Amino acid sequence: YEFAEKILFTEEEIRTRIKEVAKRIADDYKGKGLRPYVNPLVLISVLKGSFMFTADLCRALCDFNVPVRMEFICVSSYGEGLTSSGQVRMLLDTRHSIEGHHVLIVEDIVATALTLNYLYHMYFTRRPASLKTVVLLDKREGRRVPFSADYVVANIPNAFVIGYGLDYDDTYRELRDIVVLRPEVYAEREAAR
Amino acid sequence: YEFAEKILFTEEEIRTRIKEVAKRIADDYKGKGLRPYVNPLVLISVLKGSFMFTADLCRALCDFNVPVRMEFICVSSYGEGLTSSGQVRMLLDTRHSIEGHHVLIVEDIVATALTLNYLYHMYFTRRPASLKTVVLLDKREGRRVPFSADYVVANIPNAFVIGYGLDYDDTYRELRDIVVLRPEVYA
Numbered sequence: 380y381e382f383a384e385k386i387l388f389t390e391e392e393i394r395t396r397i398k399e400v401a402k403r404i405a406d407d408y409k410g411k412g413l414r415p416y417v418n419p420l421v422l423i424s425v426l427k428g429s430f431m432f433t434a435d436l437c438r439a440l441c442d443f444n445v446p447v448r449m450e451f452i453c454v455s456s457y458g459e460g461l462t463s464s465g466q467v468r469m470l471l472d473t474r475h476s477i478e479g480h481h482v483l484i485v486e487d488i489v490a491t492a493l494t495l496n497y498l499y500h501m502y503f504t505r506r507p508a509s510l511k512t513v514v515l516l517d518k519r520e521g522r523r524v525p526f527s528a529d530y531v532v533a534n535i536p537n538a539f540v541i542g543y544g545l546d547y548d549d550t551y552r553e554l555r556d557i558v559v560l561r562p563e564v565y566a567e568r569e570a571a572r
Numbered sequence: 573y574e575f576a577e578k579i580l581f582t583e584e585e586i587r588t589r590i591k592e593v594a595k596r597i598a599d600d601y602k603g604k605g606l607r608p609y610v611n612p613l614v615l616i617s618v619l620k621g622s623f624m625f626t627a628d629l630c631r632a633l634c635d636f637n638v639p640v641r642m643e644f645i646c647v648s649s650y651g652e653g654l655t656s657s658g659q660v661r662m663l664l665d666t667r668h669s670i671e672g673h674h675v676l677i678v679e680d681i682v683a684t685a686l687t688l689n690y691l692y693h694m695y696f697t698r699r700p701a702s703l704k705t706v707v708l709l710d711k712r713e714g715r716r717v718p719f720s721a722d723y724v725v726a727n728i729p730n731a732f733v734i735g736y737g738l739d740y741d742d743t744y745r746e747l748r749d750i751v752v753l754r755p756e757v758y759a
């Protein structure tokens with residue numbers, strides 16, 4: 380990728396880490412007696428970014444016999460830009476109630492944590508049986524508000540990453556690898572506005 | 573797979589076919605001058621079933637250097653027997669306007685085609701540079717309204733399939749393979 384400063388994780392690496400995280404989620408939830416139809420683990424996939432991670436994660440979870448039920452929601456905060464708007468917009472909420480069910484919010488990245496903080500708070504008041512979060516990437520040095528996900532596949536430095544569902548101006552979501560976007564590429568693009 | 577009466581496609585067979593379809597889409601768009609930001613191929617992923625197909629397809633398209641823009645839409649039924657035009661309530665629509673853009677609607681399965689036909693014409697009215705559809709599975713014999721998808725990964729018999737995004741009672745979407753649900757189970 381000529382627009383990439385560097386590749387952080389290859390597709391193979393992500394796949395490996397996701398399987399390991401799935402095995403852990405499976406072990407941690409064993410006592411919950413998850414069962415299809417009556418007791419699935421509800422995966423709240425945060426669109427658009429989480430589509431890819433969710434697709435691969437639910438499969439890895441299936442490998443470990445963890446039955447799941449997908450709920451796709453859509454939340455917006457960065458829009459076409461590089462930084463948090465400071466506002467988290469709910470564009471689509473869950474189709475069904477989460478009350479009394481085990482819920483795992485599936486996110487591609489946590490940076491300032493405004494998104495996950497807003498989401499966790501919203502669902503928390505809905506009284507699910509349990510509420511946890513799994514993030515693909517944790518940009519630890521990017522927090523504006525505190526938040527610690529229950530499961531983290533990878534930690535990354537303070538650089539704008541793209542690929543594997545993550546975008547910059549709704550571009551690059553389709554990359555198989557996670558890469559650092561060159562500032563000369565986003566600067567030119569940002570300049571175009 | 574005790575709940576399945578037969579295996580239709582394994583994850584590896586699906587993976588392969590998707591790549592062949594992506595290579596074709598790429599060739600068919602080679603003369604569209606597609607470029608990121610300004611002229612990407614807009615994939616309108618119809619939730620919830622196509623989320624998995626969309627994830628692997630966009631990656632296959634990326635293998636062929638096609639710049640894509642992902643859109644996810646959520647539709648709902650107005651009520652029972654309130655239409656036959658396949659009209660659906662739009663709970664979540666495209667973020668960007670498709671007007672003047674090359675669009676590809678992504679679906680997991682087409683059978684009756686009532687909803688997909690409705691969606692096709694709806695987006696068609698928004699005036700995109702072009703509009704095509706790609707469906708992973710097609711029950712050609714199930715049509716309730718005439719409809720032909722532009723790209724299809726596999727034609728299948730009239731049996732209820734699950735897995736690879738497809739569900740039954742919101743169950744089994746996470747399967748890596750596409751299997752036929754034991755008719756008894758479906759009831």
Ligand SMILES: O=P(O)(O)OC[C@H]1O[C@H](OP(=O)(O)OP(=O)(O)O)[C@H](O)[C@@H]1O
Nearest residue numbers: 427428455456457489490491492493494
């Ligand atoms: O921790 P935060 O600073 O809140 O940043 C993380 C959020 O920002 C991104 O979403 P975005 O708002 O870009 O929407 P998107 O998923 O559709 O790309 C990313 O997908 C997370 O949802």
Ligand SMILES: O=P(O)(O)OC[C@H]1O[C@H](OP(=O)(O)OP(=O)(O)O)[C@H](O)[C@@H]1O
Nearest residue numbers: 619620621622680681682683684685686
């Ligand atoms: O062509 P037809 O026989 O009418 O059916 C096709 C539609 O039904 C299914 O969606 P569903 O209503 O099941 O929504 P879902 O994708 O969220 O499961 C499938 O995923 C297509 O959207």
Ligand SMILES: Oc1ncnc2cn[nH]c12
Nearest residue numbers: 490538539540541545546
């Ligand atoms: O590095 C990054 N890439 C894509 N989206 C986001 C959001 N926060 N931080 C990001």
Ligand SMILES: Oc1ncnc2cn[nH]c12
Nearest residue numbers: 683731732733734738739
């Ligand atoms: O076989 C099938 N499996 C899952 N959803 C649908 C819709 N129509 N036909 C289906």
Ligand SMILES: [Mg+2]
Nearest residue numbers: 425426427428
């Ligand atoms: Mg997001």
Ligand SMILES: [Mg+2]
Nearest residue numbers: 457458546547
């Ligand atoms: Mg974004």
Ligand SMILES: [Mg+2]
Nearest residue numbers: 619620621622
């Ligand atoms: Mg569907």
Ligand SMILES: [Mg+2]
Nearest residue numbers: 621738739740
């Ligand atoms: Mg369904």
